[PDB]
Design an enzyme around this catalytic site. Structure first.
Site: not given
Ligand SMILES: Nc1ncnc2c1ncn2[C@@H]1O[C@H](COP(=O)(O)OP(=O)(O)O)[C@@H](O)[C@H]1O
Ligand SMILES: [Mg+2]
Ligand SMILES: Nc1ncnc2c1ncn2[C@@H]1O[C@H](COP(=O)(O)OP(=O)(O)OP(=O)(O)O)[C@@H](O)[C@H]1O
Ligand SMILES: Nc1ncnc2c1ncn2[C@@H]1O[C@H](COP(=O)(O)OP(=O)(O)OP(=O)(O)O)[C@@H](O)[C@H]1O
Ligand SMILES: [Mg+2]
Ligand SMILES: [Mg+2]
Lengths: 460, 52, 513, 173, 52, 85, 458
Positions: A156, A182-183
């Site tokens: 997300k 948010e964090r």
């Molecule tokens: N488009 C992407 N490309 C590469 N890694 C991804 C991608 N989306 C998510 N990830 C992986 O998933 C982790 C968490 O997604 P993130 O969006 O940061 O958490 P959330 O979805 O809970 O906000 C990222 O740090 C990465 O390791």
């Molecule tokens: Mg998240």
């Protein structure tokens, strides 16, 4: 003057007794000295005679029974307009970036009614995101509302960072970012990202932070809307990003038991649909100006049944569903095409060329999901040769919807890709027909355009 | 080491019998906020030898 | 020796020199009921919420409900001696713990009284148990490694200095083993350790402290204890007591690693307190603020920018960024992540490591599930050599598990597929590792270079374990200057790839597995 | 205990007694209504399920002294809500409101010996400075106090005893 | 094994401090009560009413 | 033990003249406001489902007739209503 | 001095003069017709009311009875005077013999030993039982828990551990009957008297028959005797007949004590009440307690709070499965869920550790194949998968054993198996040394020699 007295403190909830002729109005602010620090309380309820039940906008620690309370005869009012741009504020609209006083000319109450029915607009001008699965499966429009649904760890934030990069830099207009729940780490990294890319002057940032007492989180989202409504009423076109809408609802749940309400459903407050609707119905584009918004929505345990995500689905216009089932395979962006949807996907906007291409892709992936069950026990040799070809071409389309983002190079190590809508349509037609029947599946995975999937096949 | 330190432990207990007499009057003189040439020192030394 | 005791009998007289006879003034109440560690007090008009209330003896309670006409408070100790009509005095004080460098190698309770019996503490004053975290403008981005020493974690799920990484799984899956190996490996990294034991049995603590003492690790570690015998308020408050000790290092430009063990049990103790105080139950009978309990705890672990350190230290320390890294542990009942306490803590943290029973029984230990585990900091936490190699590992390994299911009744296997299923079995075998046997950067890097450049590819699978042991042995005798170069720098270049290529080519020809 | 449910009535009776300049009577009136509540047979009736009005009029009959249409109507209110057993706590709170309104405090003083009276002249003059109220003393001799004195006023205490100062000193292990 | 005995060293000192203090104040109660004086009692009151 | 509309000035009214039934059954006062519900003291002639008129040409529906008060739900914006209206 | 003012089930409220209110956990006494009833004080309410639990039947209690305040907790006889006798929760003799020749009585409420006092030990204790000391071996001075549903074998297994351990061990032993069957107390007493081993055993019984208050406290009466023998410097064996009943008797009174319900309706204090009991059952630098506890699992739900909390307390845990027991494999130990702190290469050494992990790996892989086999049948498997199944099934059978206490059921004579024979036996099956024998050859044979002799006659 100071004329109420505190009569209870239980957790975040404070009861104050005023004289019977000067009782504070609902949603009025109140002020008390918590030692050295000034603390604000927001009035939720009038109950009994003279007593009012309130939420602390800050820590209850160190409050005493008996402290004198001053009655401010207005709700919480926040600075609005150009002075906010480039600043970080808390829920009370106080600077938290050390840069000095905000220097406003106007302040607006965070509680206000939605636009009336006569003021709304239907100007569904299509908007390009550069993300294959979004622009094909769930096309945005200017002035609409977009929700990014998913459980923990599904993408997300980095999807929202990609959307912020592509449209919000191109937008040529002001933006609001509300960091609801948010964090603190990620709020810092975003502030430096906007500063180093030198776009921070277009954007104003309101942060809630998770750490903050329950009261701050409940109201920080309204503070973000109130700045965006000021720019809309000027007649500007603005982007509003909200880092998690779920945590606004979850902050209501915390106080709701202490506010004496009996509980409902899976522990949610009884008012869940009213609280959600009152917020979401302000985020709309009127005849004077448009607000385009992207909201992340936490889905508890990925159960899309859960009342909080299930209720918000009705308020959006495009909904993108990120699934852990896909994310488990590492195939980001992890958008589920069979669940994501948009109001804009019909031939009268998209044209028939795009509409036929999206409906085609959905039908192939749906069919393959049934075939996939047969295979797992009977084996693929047991299929029709037509069904075997559908299983092949589907399993390719599933990989071709993947795309590396140039906000994700730190995870991938690889260069991010942008695609036009025109090139996206041509690519999916090409897998649905024969042109790429001969490439492997791995030749699609995290490629970019179809025009370079052939190149990975040659490398594979 | 256990045998060695138990020798030192009985030896320290003997010398501190004198030191703890001085403690009791020093506490009493601060608690009464005034120096006091108290007469009934029999009560000090009786406790001093009996409990240690 | 013990004549020094006699000398400090003069120091007992120095207490009298420091003591003061002055009458204070204080606010007073009476205990009106006693039950299950909760007391109700009438009076105390000037009590504040979260204040320490002082009882007969040297015992204290925390004021939690300030209702009209009574205070409700929880007793920090054995309650059964308290009685109705005992007088009680409100101090001015919030709860504080001893803090400082002297704590290292000590075992203390949640109030900070030593329990190891190694005499009194040495400490650098006291710090408040409850405290607000550094705000947005005071942080710095996480971009330094903290090494686990586990092939699986350091390659796939890198932890950076100032991250919060959830260790989650069912009982008896290696949750604690992973976290004390992460402590043991800090023995020479310069990072201080804190282990917080919430609700464990005391003999289990005594065993883990023994293993920390068989290794060199105890001298670098603080152990904070609230055993299963202790009151529900000693627990609950222990994680905060541990964080207050970790923050002392964080705010002076030092790194600390804090392992909160069974944050779940902290939630159970807080549910006990809340129900005995008659606060309304929410989902699964926990109170609603249970998210605020853990989120304010875990948001204290942070990396702070140098300016914040200079301001805190008043210019004594300049140019140094301090960090506190948290590794909380949660127990799931049957892999069920949907429970209220797991869903809250998964929401807060910067990632999770899932350990699970099916892998552990299959012998995949550490039992890290590559698919549902993730680090939200990722490659920014790694050294460049690990960054370069490991990025390929984790997502390839996840897709190997999908491919292996789809394959399970396919007889013809195409060569891309045959290669992938082969490679994935050999990587799955390579990431198994024995307990208490941590690997340096150079050892992990060399073993990954063997996999990602295909030197494993011909090797038969049970020999892959012996292949790794022989390769580490060979390189340590013959090629130690490169191991020093890699461990010190973490660097990677064409000459580094060339020297590793030369070492793998030379080993695989000359030696035997 | 009844304290929390008695507060609303105690204020209203004191407020009313102020307007009608009858505070003294009301105190002597509530003192009777509390005392009938303590009688055994009356108590049984109060714990019974008699409908409010039938309970009230049987109570009012025993409370003959009560000023009709004021004191007697206060009983009817409390009988509707079944607070009659709170009357001992509706009184005393009435006395507390009165003492606040009259700016007067009872303050207490406990010592190893009967204090010298000249000392009490100093103590009362000091307490009338610490608190801006006239201070009634009702000091006590107590065996527990080894020497010195305790001053207690509301819920604030100033321990001057040697007992307290020894057990304050014995603290420093 | 040697560092263990120098930990044990501190445990032995602290336990003797505890003993002598509590038996010192136990003596002090007997000593002060037997040495109560009405002028000294009045002098306690005369001090606290001067700062109160 | 807990309060049920036992508030000081209502109590003081009764003490002066217990027979407050002398005032008209047609009207009452708001004594609580929360979450769109109001509690009203008086309205002795209220009936189930009746429309109660509020200031600002607003209405509430009478849904709980309780022994001491009426509980009513506001058919519009409620946040400016106050006790003693 | 006191007056009874309420009686609600097992709970009695007593009023005392406010200068005289009893402390928490004081014993009170009241005359109930033609008998004396003890009450234990749980809470002080306001106003000199005190809330208490009856150590006996509360029927026939009036309001207004005069209550006597005993100045002390419940105190029970301890030491050698208790050996060989059956005692009640109140420490009274329940055998028909005379009074107990006590020299000392101890209060049943005590603090656990300090962190400084605890001792480590790695001395492996052998048992007769193939699966237990293979899969979940345990040490002298450790804690063992047998977890299982109703009727799965918790008692029979504990009776073999008593037979094997507590008769080659030489010191004293304590058996605490907590909320279990009275018949089984009487059956146990006799065979102890018939074997003349009774004079080494103290027995405390608080069976299901008894009122709640008895079932709640009787576990603490049992520990308090075991703590006397430990502090005397002995090595002691403590057997607890069902620990679950202690928590359940807490659940029964908790609502009457006025505490809001938690979780699955348990008392909110469940983890503290269990922990304060469990922390006392520890070996110490002065002396040792070896403990075996049965743990009933309600509705077979191992994720219920009461089992779930108990698992962290224990050093070895043996989990009994109704699904195995209905095969008639006994003891019905689940080897994929049973576990021990002692299954570690350093203490057991490598051959044992490798054999246990091999058995665990084959049986796990057999669980992974069972869903294929259920729909497809076995013929679809690969020829290596068929060999994994063919070995796993032999392993499951060879974990079965005849027990000397179980002879009354199967008729067949019991077996005691040395640890060396177990390791050698399972290592041979996994290596395929026995791939030519039928499955029936392995069922209920003591040692691998006995499998090959059974195979000759099939
Ligand atoms: N488009 C992407 N490309 C590469 N890694 C991804 C991608 N989306 C998510 N990830 C992986 O998933 C982790 C968490 O997604 P993130 O969006 O940061 O958490 P959330 O979805 O809970 O906000 C990222 O740090 C990465 O390791
Ligand atoms: Mg998240
Ligand atoms: N890497 C490993 N290799 C082999 N065995 C291991 C490994 N890690 C842990 N174990 C073993 O797993 C068992 C349980 O480990 P640990 O006590 O850390 O699990 P846990 O999840 O903490 O259990 P609990 O839920 O009781 O706290 C121990 O016997 C330990 O020796
Ligand atoms: N080793 C065994 N050999 C033969 N039969 C057995 C064995 N173990 C258990 N059984 C059968 O199961 C019955 C019950 O066993 P046991 O009484 O130990 O169950 P339990 O777990 O104690 O049940 P409960 O919870 O009812 O006390 C025995 O009577 C016997 O019929
Ligand atoms: Mg553990
Ligand atoms: Mg049984």
């Amino acid at each position: 003057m100071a004329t109420g007295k505190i009569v209870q403190v239980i957790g975040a909830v404070v009861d104050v007794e005023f004289p019977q002729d000067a009782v504070p109005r609902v949603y009025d602010a109140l002020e008390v000295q918590n030692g050295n620090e000034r603390l604000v309380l927001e009035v939720q309820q009038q109950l009994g005679g003279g007593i009012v039940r309130t939420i602390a906008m800050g820590s209850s620690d160190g409050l005493r029974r008996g402290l004198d309370v001053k009655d401010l005869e207005h709700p919480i009012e926040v600075p609005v307009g150009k002075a906010t741009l480039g600043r970080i504020m808390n829920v009370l609209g106080e600077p938290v970036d050390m840069k000095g006083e905000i220097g406003e000319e106007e302040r607006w109450a965070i509680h206000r009614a939605a636009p009336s029915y006569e003021e709304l607009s239907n100007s569904q001008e299509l908007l390009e995101t550069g993300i294959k699965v979004i622009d094909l499966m769930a096309p945005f429009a200017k002035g609409g509302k977009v929700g990014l649904f998913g459980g923990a760890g599904v993408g997300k934030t980095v999807n929202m960072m990609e959307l912020i990069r592509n449209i919000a830099i191109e937008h040529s207009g002001y933006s609001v970012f509300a960091g609801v729940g948010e964090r603190t780490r990620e709020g810092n990294d975003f502030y430096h990202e906007m500063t180093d890319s030198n776009v921070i002057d277009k954007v104003s940032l309101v942060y809630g932070q998770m750490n903050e007492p329950p009261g701050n989180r409940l109201r920080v989202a309204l503070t973000g809307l109130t700045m965006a409504e000021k720019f809309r009423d000027e007649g500007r076109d603005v982007l509003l990003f909200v880092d998690n809408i779920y945590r606004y609802t979850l902050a209501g749940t915390e106080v709701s038991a202490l506010l004496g309400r009996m509980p409902s459903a899976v522990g949610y407050q009884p008012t869940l649909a009213e609280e959600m609707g009152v917020l979401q119905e302000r985020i709309t584009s009127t005849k004077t100006g448009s607000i385009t918004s992207v909201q992340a929505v936490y889905v508890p345990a990925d159960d899309l049944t859960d009342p909080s995500p299930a209720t918000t689905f009705a308020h959006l216009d495009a909904t993108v569903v990120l699934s852990r089932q896909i994310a488990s395979l590492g195939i980001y962006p992890a958008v589920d095409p069979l669940d994501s949807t948009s109001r804009q996907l019909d031939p009268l906007v998209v044209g028939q060329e795009h509409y036929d291409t999206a409906r085609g892709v959905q039908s192939i992936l749906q069919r393959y999901q049934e075939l996939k069950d047969i295979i797992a026990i009977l084996g693929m040799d047991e299929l029709s040769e037509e069904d075997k070809l559908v299983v092949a071409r589907a399993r390719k389309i599933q990989r071709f919807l993947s795309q590396p983002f140039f906000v994700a190079e730190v995870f991938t190590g690889s260069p991010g890709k942008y695609v036009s809508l025109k090139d996206t349509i041509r690519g999916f037609k090409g897998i649905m027909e024969g042109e790429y029947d001969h490439l492997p599946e791995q030749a699609f995975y995290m490629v970019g355009s179809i025009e370079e999937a052939v190149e990975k096949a040659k490398k594979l | 080491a256990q045998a060695e330190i138990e020798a030192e432990r009985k030896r320290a207990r003997e010398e501190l019998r004198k030191q703890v007499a001085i403690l009791a009057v020093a506490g009493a003189e601060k608690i009464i906020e005034r120096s006091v040439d108290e007469a009934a020192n029999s009560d000090i030394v009786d406790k001093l030898v009996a409990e240690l | 020796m013990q004549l020094n005791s006699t000398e400090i009998s003069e120091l007992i007289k120095q207490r009298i020199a420091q003591f003061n006879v002055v009458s204070e003034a204080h606010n007073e109440g009476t205990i009106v009921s006693v039950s299950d560690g909760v007391i109700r007090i009438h009076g105390l008009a000037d009590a504040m919420q979260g204040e320490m209330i002082s009882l007969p003896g040297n015992r204290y309670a925390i004021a939690l409900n300030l209702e009209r006409d009574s205070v409700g408070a929880v007793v920090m100790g054995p309650y059964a001696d308290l009685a109705e009509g005992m007088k009680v005095k409100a101090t001015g004080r919030i709860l504080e713990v001893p803090v400082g460098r002297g704590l290292l190698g000590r075992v203390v309770n949640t109030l900070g009284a030593p329990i190891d019996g190694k005499g009194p503490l040495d400490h650098d004053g006291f710090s408040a148990v409850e405290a607000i975290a550094p705000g947005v403008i005071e942080r710095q981005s996480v971009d330094q490694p903290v090494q686990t020493g586990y092939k699986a974690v350091d390659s796939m799920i890198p932890i950076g200095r100032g991250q919060r990484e959830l260790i989650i799984g069912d009982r008896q899956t290696g949750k604690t083993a992973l976290a004390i190996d992460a402590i043991i490996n800090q023995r020479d990294s310069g990072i201080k350790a804190i282990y917080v034991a919430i609700g464990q049995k005391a003999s289990t603590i005594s065993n883990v402290v023994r293993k920390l003492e068989e290794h060199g690790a105890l001298a670098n570690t603080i152990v904070v204890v609230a055993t299963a015998s202790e009151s529900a308020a000693l627990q609950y408050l222990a994680p905060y007591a541990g964080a207050a000790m970790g923050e002392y290092f964080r705010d002076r430009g030092e790194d600390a690693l804090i392992i909160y063990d069974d944050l779940s049990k902290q939630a159970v103790a807080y549910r006990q307190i809340s129900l005995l105080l008659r606060r309304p139950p929410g989902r699964e009978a926990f109170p609603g603020d249970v998210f605020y309990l853990h989120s304010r705890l875990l948001e204290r672990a942070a990396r702070v920018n140098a300016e914040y350190v200079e301001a805190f230290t008043k210019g004594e320390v300049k140019g140094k960024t301090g960090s506190l890294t948290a590794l909380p542990i949660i127990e799931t009942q049957a892999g069920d992540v949907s429970a209220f306490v797991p869903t809250n803590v998964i929401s807060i943290t910067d990632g999770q490591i899932f350990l699970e029973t099916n892998l552990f029984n299959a012998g995949i230990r550490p039992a890290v599930n590559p698919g549902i585990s993730v680090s939200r900091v990722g490659g920014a936490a790694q050294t460049k050599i690990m960054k370069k190699l490991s990025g390929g590992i984790r997502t390839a390994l996840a897709q190997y598990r999908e491919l292996a299911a789809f394959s399970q009744f396919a007889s013809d296997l195409d060569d891309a597929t045959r290669k992938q299923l082969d490679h994935g079995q050999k990587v799955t075998e390579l990431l198994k590792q024995k307990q208490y046997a941590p690997m340096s950067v150079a050892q992990q890097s060399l073993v990954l270079f063997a996999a990602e450049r295909g030197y494993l590819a011909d090797v038969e699978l049970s020999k892959i374990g012996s292949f790794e042991a022989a390769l580490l042995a060979y390189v340590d005798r013959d090629h130690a200057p490169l191991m020093q170069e890699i461990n010190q720098t973490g660097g990677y270049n064409d000459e580094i790839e060339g020297k590793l290529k030369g070492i793998l080519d030379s080993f695989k020809a000359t030696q035997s597995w | 205990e009844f304290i929390t449910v008695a507060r609303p009535y105690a204020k209203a009776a004191f407020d009313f007694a102020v307007e009608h300049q009858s505070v003294e009577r009301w105190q002597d009136m509530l003192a009777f209504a509390a005392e009938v509540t303590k009688n055994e047979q009356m108590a049984e009736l109060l714990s019974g399920a008699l409908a409010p009005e039938t309970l009230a009029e049987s109570f009012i009959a025993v409370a003959g002294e009560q000023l009709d249409e004021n004191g007697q109507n206060l009983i009817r209110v409390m009988a509707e809500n079944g607070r009659l057993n709170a009357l001992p706590d509706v009184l005393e709170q009435f006395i507390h409101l009165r003492a606040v309104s009259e700016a007067t405090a009872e303050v207490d003083v406990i010592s190893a010996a009967a204090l010298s009276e000249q000392q009490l002249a100093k103590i009362s003059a000091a307490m009338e400075k610490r608190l801006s109220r006239k201070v009634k003393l009702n000091a006590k001799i107590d065996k527990s106090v080894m020497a010195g004195v305790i001053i207690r006023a509301g819920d604030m205490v100033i321990d001057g005893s040697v007992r307290g100062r020894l057990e304050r000193l014995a603290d420093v292990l």
